[PDB]
Paper text:
Dog [name] (dAPN) has been identified as the animal receptor with the highest capability to mediate the virus infection. The dAPN, like hAPN and pAPN, can be divided into four subdomains, among which Domains II and IV interact with the RBDs of PDCoV and [name].
Here, the open conformation of dAPN is identified in the [name] [name]-dAPN complex structure, in which Domain IV is distant from Domain II; thus, the catalytic site could be exposed. However, the binding sites of the [name] [name] are mainly located in Domain IV, and Domain II contributed little (9%) to the BSA of the [name] [name]. In comparison, the binding affinity of the [name] [name] to the Q746K and Q746K-D750E mutants is approximately 16- and 77-fold weaker, respectively. The mutant T749R, which can lose the N747-linked glycan, lost its high binding affinity with the [name] [name] compared to wild-type dAPN.
Residue numbers in the entry:
A (entry chain a): 27 to 33, 35 to 163, 165 to 170
B (entry chain b): 74 to 978
Write the structure that this text describes.
């Protein structure tokens, strides 16, 4: 819960394409923006011991095309929340921080102990858009 | 007879070079006749001196330069004597130049003759192509040079055998820009003849047939592209289209395919310029000419926004076929038009490999069996089909040259090529082709030379051994039409081969020495285990132990359908194979699984196997999720649907189908995440369309909900299209059928409004689907008026109306009442009149329906049916056969199908 340091927060661009049954559904290629950590954009391991970890969702819609310019409308509008079954801790982006020695946000499954799971929340259904792999534990970092 | 009377150009006149100066008029004259007038020098050597010289020039009057029509100038050692007269034979349409003076043997005479010709839009010779851009008609000079057409455009010694280097000076309006097979030797001259006339010199082409040479003057915009190899590619397209960028995908596709082909051929492309031209309307849709390839706009250009995945496939395949042609049949010259079937066949098979190279994910090779082999399976099965081999003697007239281009020639040729590659194991085949290309470059050639090279490569490598010579195996397949059926009894291992005719009773007039006994390459699996390849001899019956099985084990044949043949099994084996299929489809390969459904239905049509066995093949489809088996089944079931749609059998049939379709629809829904994650693979994408359409047609309430939601979404904000392009057609038709008049009107308004041909075509099909009788009648009336529907479009609209079951009766009546007006417009000029007759009578299975057809034929006999006359006889025969089926087997089939469907419900 304590943050030794609280000083960039990921934004999940959300791609939503309607099913055609009228049900809003999350789509592949939704982009969680990961800021450049030193040289590498994909993996951010925070220099700060603890993380603010705020989540921002931008809704984008595609008729069928890859282009997501069309704005999310009606049922399609959605918000993304990260809660993970795979990590032993539920980790719903809580102020409470559980363990960790090194926290990273790998976009690669290999080399990562557990994956934070971000789920788009729609009124009809909750669908997990992406798994954010995390090289996961130490007494030193809370 | 006379040498000019003979179609063939005399061998003695061989053209060393052609210098052609031509001035097309792209400005209408006082007469209004656009005219191409030019003076062309014929530089040629006479192997045997001939006083009379024969040139292939068609329908050209000759202007006189000073005193004579032909002025001959000889420089230095080369000497030329001016020719007194130019005459054209009416029978052969060939220019003959008559010179009183005897010619000097093997000397160069340059014959410059002024000629006058008229540019007419017949898509032949020198013709004009017109496109409306921004409301303005645009005039472009175009050359069709195939066969006799080259002669019409300019005097030439036209033969595949005759090869010349062509230096072209083109005088054209300055605004328009000239093109030729070769790069320009000299820049266009603004004021050389007149300020309006621009004269562009062109480099001498590498020696090639005159038909290969082409020159195009066009207003098309260009974005030049250069490969690392320095071949200049790019596209000629209208300026608005260039702004659209539709051609960009085609440009992206061409470069890798060229490189891949060059590696397989082992020869780099000789020409440093290859130009793809988007002709606004091209009847062929593609050009095989060396250097200059002109395509119809639809084939060449792909729009990402409004075009389906099928369209994307079309663009890649057509480009590959043409690229293959440049190396094959152009660099190594084709000896004569008779060898065209081989050239086209080689190109099509190679095109599939090239397309696969371009798109690795798509399994184009898997698609080849459905696209080519299955398509000609139907034509070959008919006894009337021609033998694949074509003799040089047979092809003489221009019409004969046109005859060689046919579906069997390209598609069957590709299938035989695939089989050949399999016996040669690919590498030897590639080596042979490469060697043949290098050895015979710039020489007219026959298939035997290529075959010898493949055989030589096989001779070099001892690792793979062929029991029979490559030429011998190939000959059996090429010489005779059709395919054998191999029947194997598991208990004894005996194998038997006989010809397959889809018709149960037919007579094959054509005679072959082989008598349909063919050497067959057999690949076999026993109980899931591969067996050593067996080469079947061309003998009716042989016994092999490997085929024999005991107890549980089952046998399979023709793995991957590499061979061009049907297969049959003993009934116990069939049952075992079917049982295995229910328990596990994995042991069977995908191509083989498709093969069993297709084969059983074909055998059922010929009555070799019972109708119930074919239905048993459909039983495992509940488990099957793959595209190829499902596609084969749907195609087979279409005949059943047409015959039983109005009968009582339809209700039970619908229930059985609903049960088989539902797991596939559900599986697809789950994989596609409720229809938004459309599958990337081409085969998978195609199956997604199949599932939606079949489900909607028979029951499946969930499908109806999806279609309704999608159409409603389209109606709001109509200009942007929510519907996925692959799925657009299904939603539109279904919605119109469920919907009332308001639905029909909305679609009609869109059909008139849409600029795109493809979109307009989709809308046109949807209009026919409406249930109400009155609506259909109003639509039928709309067609006659020119403003509402264009003439070419009218034939298609009538065909779709016949397809609707409620509409079938109405369409038939309209056709009888308005026959004369339609006949004058489309019977003349062969505008798919035969196709229109074929669309009617598709669903006709009753005696009463046959009687109506006979009456119409008698009543309108005096008026005449134009192109449709042959089709009318064919349509009547088809109807008779459906009723005939009822007389012998369909009455039983109707009862049985009902019983089988009832049991499976
Ligand atoms: C993909 O779509 C399937 C099928 O959806 C079907 O078509 C739609 C137009 C809707 O009308 C669906 O109701 C219809 O079945 C979805 O499966 C369906 O999920 C819905 C929503 O959870 C289920 O409805 C529920 O039914 C239960 C009955 O036990 C009620 O208690 C609930 O209140 C609710 O109404 C429906 O049973 C279920 N249908 C099937 C075939 O199981 C599926 O959710 C969807 N997938 C995605 C990616 O969203
Ligand atoms: C998340 O980022 C990815 C890129 O990593 C986005 O995918 C990309 O979307 C663009 C815009 O549609 C695609 O451009 C397209 O290119 C094709 C030709 O290749 C063209 O025909 C289209 O009109 C368009 O210009 C791009 O190819 C595509 N890239 C991939 C990897 O497929 C994705 O859309 C983003 N998602 C969100 C939520 O914004
Ligand atoms: C190995 O394959 C090559 C490729 O065809 C064969 O070489 C040809 O030899 C023939 C005479 O037999 C010539 O007519 C061709 O011009 C040669 N092609 C070239 C240029 O390589 C050779 O015959 C094969 N060797 C064996 C053992 O069959
Ligand atoms: C029959 O065709 C199948 C389907 O293409 C072949 O399976 C491929 O095998 C190659 C190598 O042999 C693999 O690289 C591909 O991944 C396979 N494709 C798929 C989609 O499975 C199979 O090899 C062929 N069988 C025979 C008898 O040649
Ligand atoms: C199609 O399959 C059906 C059953 O799925 C076959 O009917 C069986 O026939 C065998 C022997 O012919 C009998 O032992 C079974 O009792 C039958 N089963 C039932 C439930 O009727 C049918 O013979 C198959 N069709 C053909 C022509 O092989
Ligand atoms: C989405 O809305 C933004 C802001 O008004 C606008 O710039 C954009 O054009 C819209 N996208 C589409 C195509 O709906």
């Amino acid at each position: 819960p304590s943050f030794y340091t609280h000083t960039v927060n990921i934004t999940i661009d959300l791609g939503m394409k309607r099913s055609g049954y009228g049900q809003p559904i999350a789509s592949t290629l939704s982009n969680i923006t990961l800021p450049m950590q030193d040289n590498n954009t994909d993996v951010y391991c925070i220099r700060s011991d603890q993380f603010s970890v705020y989540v921002h969702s931008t809704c984008k819609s595609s008729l069928w095309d890859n282009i997501f310019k069309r704005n999310c409308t009606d049922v399609l509008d959605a918000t993304a929340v990260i809660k993970t079954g795979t990590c032993p801790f539920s980790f719903d982006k809580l102020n409470n921080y559980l363990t960790f020695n090194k926290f990273c946000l790998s976009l690669s499954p290999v080399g990562a102990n557990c994956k934070f799971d971000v789920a788009a929340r729609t009124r009809t259904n909750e669908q997990v858009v992406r798994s954010l792999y995390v090289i996961y534990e130490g007494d030193n970092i809370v | 007879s006379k040498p000019w009377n003979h179609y063939r150009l005399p061998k003695t006149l061989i053209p060393s070079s052609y210098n052609v100066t031509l001035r097309p008029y792209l400005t209408p004259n006082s007469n209004g006749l656009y005219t191409f007038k030019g003076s062309s020098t014929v530089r040629f050597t006479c192997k045997e001196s001939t006083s009379m010289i024969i040139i292939h020039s068609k329908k050209l009057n000759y202007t006189n330069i000073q005193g004579q029509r032909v002025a001959l100038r000889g420089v230095g050692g080369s000497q030329a004597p001016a020719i007194d007269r130019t005459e054209l034979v009416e029978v052969t349409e060939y220019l003959v130049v008559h010179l009183r003076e005897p010619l000097q043997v093997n000397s160069q005479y340059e014959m410059d003759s002024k000629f006058e010709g008229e540019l007419a839009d017949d898509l032949a010779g020198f013709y004009r192509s017109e496109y409306t851009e921004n409301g303005v008609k645009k005039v472009l000079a175009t050359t069709q040079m195939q066969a006799a057409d080259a002669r019409k455009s300019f005097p030439c010694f036209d033969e595949p055998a005759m090869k010349a280097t062509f230096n072209i000076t083109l005088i054209h309006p300055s605004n328009l820009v000239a093109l030729s097979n070769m790069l320009p030797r000299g820049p266009s001259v603004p004021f050389t003849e007149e300020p309006n006339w621009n004269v562009t010199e062109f480099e001498t082409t590498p020696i090639m047939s005159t038909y290969l040479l082409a020159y195009i003057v066009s207003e098309f915009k260009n974005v030049q592209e250069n490969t690392p190899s320095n071949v200049l590619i790019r596209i000629w397209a209208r300026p608005s289209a260039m702004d659209q960028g539709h051609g960009n995908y085609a440009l992206r596709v061409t470069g890798p395919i060229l490189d891949f082909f060059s590696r397989h051929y082992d020869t780099p492309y000789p020409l440093n310029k290859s130009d793809q031209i988007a002709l606004p309307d091209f009847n062929a849709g593609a050009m095989e000419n060396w250097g200059l390839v002109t395509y119809r706009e639809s084939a060449l250009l792909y729009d990402p926004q409004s075009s389906s995945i099928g369209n994307k496939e079309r663009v890649v395949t057509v480009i590959a076929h043409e690229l293959a042609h440049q190396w094959f049949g152009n660099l190594v010259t084709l000896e004569w038009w008779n060898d065209l079937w081989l050239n086209e066949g080689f190109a099509s098979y190679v095109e599939y490999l090239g397309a696969d190279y371009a798109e690795p994910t798509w399994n184009l090779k898997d698609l080849i069996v459905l696209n080519e082999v299955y398509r000609v399976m139907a034509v070959d099965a008919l006894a009337s089909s021609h033998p694949l081999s074509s003799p040089a003697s047979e092809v003489n007239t221009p019409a004969q040259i046109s005859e060689v281009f046919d579906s069997i020639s390209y598609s069957k040729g590709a299938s035989v090529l695939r089989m050949l590659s399999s016996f040669l194991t690919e590498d030897l085949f590639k080596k042979g082709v490469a060697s043949y290309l290098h050895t015979f470059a710039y020489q007219n050639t026959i298939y035997l030379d290529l075959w010898n090279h493949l055989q030589w490569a096989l001779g070099n490598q001892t690792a793979i051994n062929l029991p029979y010579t490559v030429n011998a195996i190939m000959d059996r397949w090429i010489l005779q039409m059709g395919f054998p059926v191999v029947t194997v009894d598991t208990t004894t291992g005996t194998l038997s081969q006989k010809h397959f005719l889809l018709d149960p009773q037919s007579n094959v007039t054509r005679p072959s020495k082989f008598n349909y006994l063919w050497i067959i390459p057999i690949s076999s699996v026993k109980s899931g285990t591969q067996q050593a390849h067996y080469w079947m001899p061309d003998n009716a019956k042989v016994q092999n132990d490997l085929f024999k099985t005991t107890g549980d084990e089952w046998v399979l044949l023709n793995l991957n359908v590499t061979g061009y043949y049907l297969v049959n099994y003993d009934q116990n084996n069939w049952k075992k194979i079917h049982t295995q299929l229910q328990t596990d489809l994995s042991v069977i390969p995908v191509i083989n699984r498709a093969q069993v459904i297709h084969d059983t239905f074909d055998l059922a049509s010929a009555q070799i196997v019972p109708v119930t066995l074919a239905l048993n093949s459909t039983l495992f489809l509940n488990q099957e999720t793959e595209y190829m088996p499902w596609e084969a089944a749907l195609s087979s079931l279409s005949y059943f649907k047409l015959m039983f749609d109005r009968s009582e059998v339809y209700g039970p049939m619908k229930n059985y189908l609903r049960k088989q379709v539902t797991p596939l629809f559900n599986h697809f829904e789950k994989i596609t995440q409720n229809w938004t994650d459309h599958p990337q693979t081409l085969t998978e994408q195609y199956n997604e369309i199949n599932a939606v359409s079949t489900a909607c047609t028979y029951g499946v309430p969930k499908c109806k909900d999806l279609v309704s939601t999608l159409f409603a979404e389209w109606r709001k904000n109509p200009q942007n299209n929510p519907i996925y392009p692959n799925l657009r057609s299904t939603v539109y038709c279904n919605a119109i059928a469920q919907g009332g008049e308001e639905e029909w009107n909305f679609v009609w308004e869109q059909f008139r409004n849409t600029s795109l041909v493809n979109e307009a075509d989709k809308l046109r099909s949807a209009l026919a689907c409406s249930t109400q009788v009155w609506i259909l009648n109003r639509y039928l009336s709309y067609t006659l008026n020119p403003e509402f529907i264009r003439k070419q479009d009218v034939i298609s609209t009538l065909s779709s109306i016949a397809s609707n079951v409620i509409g079938q009766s109405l369409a038939w009546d309209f056709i009888q009442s308005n026959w004369k007006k339609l006949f004058e417009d489309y019977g003349t000029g062969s505008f798919s009149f035969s196709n229109l007759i074929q669309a009617v009578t598709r669903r006709f299975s009753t005696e009463f329906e046959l009687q109506q057809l006979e009456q119409f034929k008698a009543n309108n006999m005096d008026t005449g049916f134009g192109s449709g006359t042959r089709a009318l006889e064919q349509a009547l025969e088809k109807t008779k056969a459906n009723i005939k089926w009822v007389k012998e087997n369909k009455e039983a089939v109707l009862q049985w199908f009902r019983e089988n469907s009832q049991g499976g419900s």
